[PDB]
């Protein structure tokens, strides 16, 4: 198993915003310098891309960091999927993919934070 990621998603409907709180991961399996990348599916523009800071020398990182998309409508909630990738930063070399999961936004309710604990998959 590649590891387990904990996170929370909030559709801030009044503000057309999706707040993605990346909390922590447990038992990552690349040592590692973990960081998390977010991509909104149906989405090519690098505006669809958000990313957490990088942590050092940990297989159980705690970012506790919130990343926010704006321009999110109910239609986007129905149509889109949040891709969440955990990667390993190898400075001056090649960054390695660790694991991912995806959350269809239609599973979220407006103004209600939903928390997730997911065992990561490969690509």
Curated annotation (Swiss-Prot):
Instruction: Tell me the domain of life.
Output: Eukaryota
Give the consequence of mutating residue 90 to N. Binds liposomes in a calcium-independent manner
Main role? Calcium sensor which positively regulates SNARE-dependent fusion of vesicles with membranes. Binds phospholipids in a calcium-dependent manner and may act at the priming stage of fusion by modifying membrane curvature to stimulate fusion. Involved in calcium-triggered exocytosis in chromaffin cells and calcium-dependent spontaneous release of neurotransmitter in absence of action potentials in neuronal cells. Involved both in glucose-stimulated insulin secretion in pancreatic cells and insulin-dependent GLUT4 transport to the plasma membrane in adipocytes.
Question: Per UniProt, where does Ca(2+) 1 bind?
Answer: 33, 88, 90
Q: Which residues form the C2 domain?
A: 1-120
What are the recorded Gene Ontology BP terms?
A: calcium ion-regulated exocytosis of neurotransmitter; calcium-dependent activation of synaptic vesicle fusion; exocytosis; positive regulation of calcium ion-dependent exocytosis; positive regulation of insulin secretion; positive regulation of vesicle fusion; protein localization; spontaneous neurotransmitter secretion
Expression across tissues: Expressed in brain; highly enriched in neurons.
Q: Which UniProt keywords apply?
A: Calcium, Calcium/phospholipid-binding, Cell membrane, Cytoplasm, Membrane, Metal-binding, Phosphoprotein, Repeat
Give the species this sequence originates from. Answer: Rattus norvegicus
Q: Name one GO cellular component term.
A: synapse
Quote the annotated effect of residue 88 to N: Binds liposomes in a calcium-independent manner
- Where found, per UniProt? Cytoplasm; Cytoplasmic granule; Cell membrane
Output the Gene Ontology terms for molecular function.
calcium ion binding; calcium-dependent phospholipid binding; syntaxin binding
Protein's name in the database = Double C2-like domain-containing protein beta
Main location group: cytoplasm
Task: Give the multimer and partner information.
Answer: Interacts with STX4; the interaction is calcium-dependent, increased by insulin and glucose, and mediates vesicle fusion with plasma membrane in pancreatic cells and adipocytes. Interacts with STXBP3; the interaction is direct, occurs at the cell membrane and regulates glucose-stimulated insulin secretion. Interacts with cytoplasmic dynein light chain DYNLT1. Interacts with the SNARE (soluble N-ethylmaleimide-sensitive factor attached protein receptor) complex composed of SNAP25, STX1A and VAMP2; the interaction is calcium-dependent and competitive with SYT1.
Q: What is stated about domains?
A: C2 domain 1 is involved in binding calcium and phospholipids. C2 domain 2 may also play a role in the calcium-dependent targeting to membranes.
């Amino acid at each position: 198993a590649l590891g387990t990621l904990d996170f929370s998603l909030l559709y801030d409907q009044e503000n057309n915003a999706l707040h993605c709180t990346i909390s922590k991961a447990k038992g990552l399996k690349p040592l590692a310098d973990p960081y998390v990348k977010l991509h909104l599916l149906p989405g090519a523009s690098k505006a669809n891309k958000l990313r957490t800071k990088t942590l050092r020398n940990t297989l159980n990182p705690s970012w506790n960091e919130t990343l926010t998309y704006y321009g999110i409508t109910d239609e986007d909630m129905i149509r889109k999927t949040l891709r969440i990738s955990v990667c390993d930063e190898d400075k001056f070399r090649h960054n390695e993919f660790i694991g991912e999961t995806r959350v269809p936004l239609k599973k979220l309710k407006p103004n209600h934070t939903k928390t997730f604990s997911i065992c990561l998959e490969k690509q």
